[PDB]
Design a protein around this ligand. Structure first.
Ligand code: NA
Ligand code: NA
Ligand code: NA
Length: 320
DNA sequence: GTCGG
DNA sequence: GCTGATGCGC
DNA sequence: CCGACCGCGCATCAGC
């Protein structure tokens, strides 16, 4: 209903992140765009929007200007500035953030073609981002997410049957498509109390030509690129993350990385109401002075809901 | 840019 | 070479 | 009025 407005706000967000290097303004604009996107009426004025949380005085003014004129002069200015628009474009390459993009543009590197000419000036991450520029911007239909899941769960199984693997994100909530694949991994041998555990899994996924490129990889986190097996149309390359988490912190991690972010907000709020604090890693009781005690045992997501006396919420009912 | 202490 | 800072994506 | 707004793992750099 307010597609024009939320587009305007997103454009402003991208400009603050990429050109102004103002990450909190970026997120303020995103917050505004989200809350307006969800508003079940066609906004008729700035004052109306300002009733919404995340929408303040300045955004209300831009909404008035947009509604009267169908544009923002601030945005037209920005779009007609070659430097700003080139900086903004270059950050669409994974690995090229606001700093690299400004540096590149400063020396006349402004397009994909320019990057290709200057690949010697890119780091490994950036080269991969450039290589799969188009594929990385594609969404992943749920039916492919399911084929990808089966591959990952099976190959993990082949390395060792005690591995536990869970594909999280909006996917786990029943999303009809995903931006990437986020995999949480654990193993009985890994706990916060006390060895190539992730490597063995990455190596096997490479072995079967599922994982095709690595952006980064250490003992607990892998970020890379994967592709489904193809005499017909070859699949786009996709971003996959794999995180190795201690088993005693595993289901808190699943909970967190399943979201939604709004769901996590309401659940941490409710946990506090009842004398617990939940973060990505643990659920801890609060003493009366507000001192967090030791992390509680967690053997499943359900355990966390139990502790705070909340009725178990199916992942697909976790929109908020 | 918006919010809350 | 070593340590701590920064950039980056999440 | 003023600081918070998540903060972490990894790659790379800055400074030594
Ligand atoms: Na508001
Ligand atoms: Na980028
Ligand atoms: Na605050």
């Amino acid at each position: 209903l307010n597609g024009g407005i939320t587009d305007m706000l997103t454009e402003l967000a991208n400009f603050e992140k990429n050109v102004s290097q103002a990450i909190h303004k970026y997120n303020a604009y995103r917050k505004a765009a989200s809350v307006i996107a969800k508003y079940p009426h066609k906004i008729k004025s700035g004052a109306e929007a300002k009733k919404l949380p995340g929408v303040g005085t300045k955004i209300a003014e831009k909404i008035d200007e947009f509604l009267a004129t169908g544009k923002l002069r601030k945005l037209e200015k920005i779009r007609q500035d070659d430097t700003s628009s080139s900086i903004n474009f270059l950050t669409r390459v994974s690995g090229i953030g606001p700093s690299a993009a400004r540096k590149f543009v400063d020396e006349g590197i402004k397009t994909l073609e320019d990057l290709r000419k200057n690949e010697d000036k890119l780091n490994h991450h950036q080269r991969i981002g450039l290589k799969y520029f188009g594929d990385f911007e594609k969404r992943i239909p749920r039916e492919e997410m399911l084929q990808m899941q089966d591959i990952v769960l099976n190959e993990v199984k082949k390395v060792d049957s005690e591995y536990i693997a869970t594909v999280c994100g909006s996917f786990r909530r029943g999303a009809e498509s995903s931006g990437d694949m986020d995999v949480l991994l654990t193993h009985p041998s890994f706990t916060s109390e006390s060895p190539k555990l992730l490597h063995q899994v990455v190596e096997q996924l490479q072995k079967v030509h599922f994982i095709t490129d690595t952006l980064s990889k250490g003992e607990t986190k892998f970020m890379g690129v994967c592709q489904l097996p193809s005499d017909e149309k070859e699949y786009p390359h996709r971003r996959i993350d794999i995180r190795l988490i201690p088993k005693d912190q595993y289901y808190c991690g699943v909970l967190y990385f399943t979201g939604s972010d709004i769901f996590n907000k309401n659940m941490r709020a409710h946990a506090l109401e009842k004398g617990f604090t939940i973060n990505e890693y643990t659920i801890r009781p609060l003493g009366v002075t507000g001192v967090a005690g030791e992390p509680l045992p967690v053997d499943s997501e359900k355990d966390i809901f139990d502790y705070i006396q909340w009725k178990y919420r199916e992942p697909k009912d976790r929109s908020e």
